[PDB]
Amino acid sequence: NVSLMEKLKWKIKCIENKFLNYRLTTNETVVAETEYGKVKGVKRLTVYDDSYYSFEGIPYAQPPVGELRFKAPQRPTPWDGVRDCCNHKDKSVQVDFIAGKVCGSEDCLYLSVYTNNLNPETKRPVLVYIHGGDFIIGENHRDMYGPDYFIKKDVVLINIQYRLGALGFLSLNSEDLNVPGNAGLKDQVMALRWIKNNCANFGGNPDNITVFGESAGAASTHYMMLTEQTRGLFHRGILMSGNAICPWANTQCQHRAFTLAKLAGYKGEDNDKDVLEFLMKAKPQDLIKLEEKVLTLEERTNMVVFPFGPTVEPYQTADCVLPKHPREMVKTAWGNSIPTMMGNTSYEGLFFTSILKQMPMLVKELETCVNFVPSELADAERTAPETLEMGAKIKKAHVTGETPTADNFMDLCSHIYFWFPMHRLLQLRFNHTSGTPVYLYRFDFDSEDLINPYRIMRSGRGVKGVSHADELSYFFWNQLAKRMPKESREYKTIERMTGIWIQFATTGNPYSNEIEGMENVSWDPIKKSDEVYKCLNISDELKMIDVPEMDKIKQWESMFEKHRDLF
Secondary structure, three states: OOOHHHHHHHHHHHHHHHHHHHHOEEEEEEEEOOOOOEEEEEEEEOOOOOEEEEEEEEEOOOOOOHHHOOOOOOOOOOOOOEEEOOOOOOOEOEEOOOOOOEEOEOOOOEEEEEEOOOOOOOOEEEEEEEOOOOOOOOOOOOOOOEOOOHHHOOOEEEEEOOOOHHHHHOOOOOHHHOOOOOHHHHHHHHHHHHHHHHHHHHOEEEEEEEEEEEOHHHHHHHHHHHOHHHOOOOOEEEEEOOOOOOHHHOOOOOOHHHHHHHHOOOOOOOOHHHHHHHHHHOOHHHHHHHHHHOOOHHHHHOOOOOOOOOOOOOOOOOOOOOOOOHHHHHHHOHHHHOOEEEEEEOOHHHHHHHHHHHOHHHHHHHOOOHHHOOOOOOOOOOOOHHHHHHHHHHHHHHOOOOOOOHHHHHHHHHHHHHHHHHHHHHHHHHHHOOOOOEEEEEEOOOOOOOOOOHHHHOOOOOOOOOOOOHHHHHOOEOOOOOOOOOOOHHHHHHHHHHHHHHHHHHHOOOOOOOOOOOOOOOOOOOOOOOOOOEEEEEOOOEEEEEOOOHHHHHHHHHHHOOOHHHO
8 A cells, every 4th residue: 555645746756757758759750560560669768868769559469358358369450551659558457556546458468669770780689578567467668667778788678568467367167168367478478479570670680589577577487488389489588586486476266257257246156158258248447446355265364365367277278378387387398498597686575564564463474484384385274283393494594583573574575485486496497408507696786766666565765675676677767767877876787787688688698798897707507416506696796696595495495305296
């Protein structure tokens, strides 16, 4: 929940940003070709007086409306003439993260393309960003994801949208209905196919595509690395604070359509056909507004995070993305064999600051920690002595003083949601790769002089520490950003972060002696034989270090000593 004070501050920023964006618009437009027809973009400036060509609102699928609601995306219809791509389209239907009202449109299957030069001297690395937001919020609007920092360099940057919430992730068991789930991930697949087939029209190299994303966008990038649907479509992946085997990254939601339908007024019985017929006629704002009530008492008890999201699909279809649990998909995944970079911030769990302020009794979960034991290890009642013993191990790892604290809780959150699933993924993947390198980073640069709207969500004004999503301020311009002095630590961090990402996108190796402060860095990928992970720690300096989280990671791993087949 955001304070009325911040809500007014945000409204002011929205208006000032609109007029800034007018002043950053030039009168120069340009036409580019696509496989479906011509698109008109516009040349824009940044506050640093770089410039780029901007194409927003390029459709990669038919609008998923009418009969196409809840279905896999369908290829767009070609057009004659020139499609205006000089303004953004709407975002997927969602609850606005500040206003608390439903916004967006079902007509949301668009991507945006940015480059400083449409006819470059050499074909360019293509970087594709998949936004996070727990599969329920997010957008490719430049008030949050401005390309202004990346286009300083000679890359093509593409920001996609995909369907969110129940409209993107409804799943029904009945094969006749053709709603198996994961429509939003199938949207990402269709966008990646568009990019492969069209990036050359914007100066991009279709043989050198990098997909990256943060939070649910990292889980998404990983899903795109796992599924056969995308085999060979891109060439590097970057997983920023998340992956597809994170506990929050998938769910079995096939029974929840009936519950959502009932909340929306459905009077019938629980059969998929009648439930789907009702949901097809519902207003989309109503469905998205009610999503927050869908989890049952039993599901909340079992700590299910979100009602709708990526799911293991119940039957096979032509467009099936997840035919098995992602842990199993790792065993055969094409993306295990492309260069990969993974990392997290240095205090991920600081994201839950405001939740702990609202429910301080949450700290009592640290008394035994049994509710943090991985579900595959815990008895159903979480009362078995062995479950209590694993809880005690988690408690030892994170409770540093006599009484558990909110900081202890947030430290635990960093591990359960980010560091431990990283570790489990690295170790699983080593069994199913042929030497392709994986590099680790740790983002450890703290500033409140350059922020992004996630800080308002966690009520993070004045809070020290590098929270989940704090690094996005150094990758993307946003409407809370300001021009920073060239000599400032924030400016240098923009240069370093975009620089490392572009270097990795280009070569599959994130090191470059051209990046300031990187000269003396020896950044080796993680080897199967490594017992302690090494990472590039990004603070005011760039330093290789043993991952500070390693000891706690090993303590979590120790829970599986007598259950190694589940690790």
